[PDB]
Amino acid sequence: ALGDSINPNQVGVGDNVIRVNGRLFEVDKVQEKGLKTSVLDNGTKVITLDNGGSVAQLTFLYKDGPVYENIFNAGISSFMKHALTKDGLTSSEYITKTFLQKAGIIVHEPTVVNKSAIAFTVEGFRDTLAQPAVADKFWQSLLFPRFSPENVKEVKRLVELESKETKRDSPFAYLQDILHKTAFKGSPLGHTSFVPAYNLGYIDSNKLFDRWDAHYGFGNIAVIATNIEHEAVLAAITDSAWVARAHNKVGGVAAPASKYSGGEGYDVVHRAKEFDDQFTDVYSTYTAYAFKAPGRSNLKEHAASLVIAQALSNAVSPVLNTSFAPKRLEVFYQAYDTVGLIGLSSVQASNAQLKAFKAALSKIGTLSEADLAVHKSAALLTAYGNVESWRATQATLIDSFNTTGQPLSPLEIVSAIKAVSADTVKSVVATMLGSPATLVHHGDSPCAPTLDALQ
């Protein structure tokens, strides 16, 4: 105890322990709040959603992505995805990552969220993330870059591998890339998420520095936390000397809106001649049949679209799932600011299948209040599943803040899903079917369905 030459184990129970009619109990307090938001006087915005869990995630959101590129910069954001994580001016890659990894912190690979921002996410016990050193390292990375040529060469190798692997191992993700590229033909949402071949040689340190200067500004950075008390977060990202040593400037970047074509339309690749057939699928054609759907701008229409997407997904996917069920279909709902896509991506698609999907959507249109209860319940089950998970909470916060600029806790979405109305869903489906389709073909085979054969 608090003695000299006294057994350290010679200590009694804590002062917060009581013994009542035998077995002992403990006394403690209460904590936690809802969703909280703040803005630093230099422009940075902080969003927090505490839930009382012991594991926390901290994300630095940096505003850059395909929607900010042009045909000559295509893919530059991908370099920015990695260049910022490599050696900087004041901390190399070895210093930061190891220092974070040896501190029991999981460092995730940076990602592009809504084609408009880059998230650098870190995961660990809240107490380890609340200390002002992790945030300090992220500030160093974002504010004092170096963009060394050898690091740029490494990033070129990484982006080549990413594109090739996604094409080979994630044919549905590549199909989504094609779907957006042809969906929003002459608009920012139609830019490519992968570096095109030519630009692989063109992007270098000077271009990266020019883009960093263009996108510089504390207004292009946000902090999002999911199991850290708000005040602690403010105590962590404001103790950095490097923030005080950086040029103070609020610099925003804006991108235009989008329109929608997609099409009876096609990206040709002979997979059987590109990859070895044993450990990848090389004899399939990937068809994405998509319609225009509302974005996150209007919460009511977004909740209606969520209900519609859940209804479509449950009516197609098997109810009884086995261990090794293959992946042949996916019902996707990609929601953006003021525009979105909802559709079905499949292999070996058929005109009969796509007609059935369209008819199912139309049938969903005509449902009544009583018939909408079942689908609302299924959507609520999914929404609660998102509410109960810290990873899902972080994803929802990032998406809601990025697309609209107004955070939205998963629980709030629940309140919006059970306020959905039959009239709202009817209007939403009328909007969906009142515009041309996207029959974005990708694959190889010539027997693929065509829009003239559907509509």
Partner: protein, 41 residues
């Protein structure tokens, strides 16, 4: 210099061991008010 103590407050060293608190040794984790203040919250 190792672990230098700060302040000359009391430490249970060989010369000084202090006056034992038998009340806390016996009534460990059990409140005293049930006996000194019966029937009061």
């Amino acid at each position: 210099l190792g672990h230098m103590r700060v302040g000359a407050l009391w430490q249970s060293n060989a010369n000084s061991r202090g006056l034992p608190n038998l009340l806390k040794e016996v009534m460990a984790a059990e409140p005293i008010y049930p006996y000194t203040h019966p029937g009061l919250s």
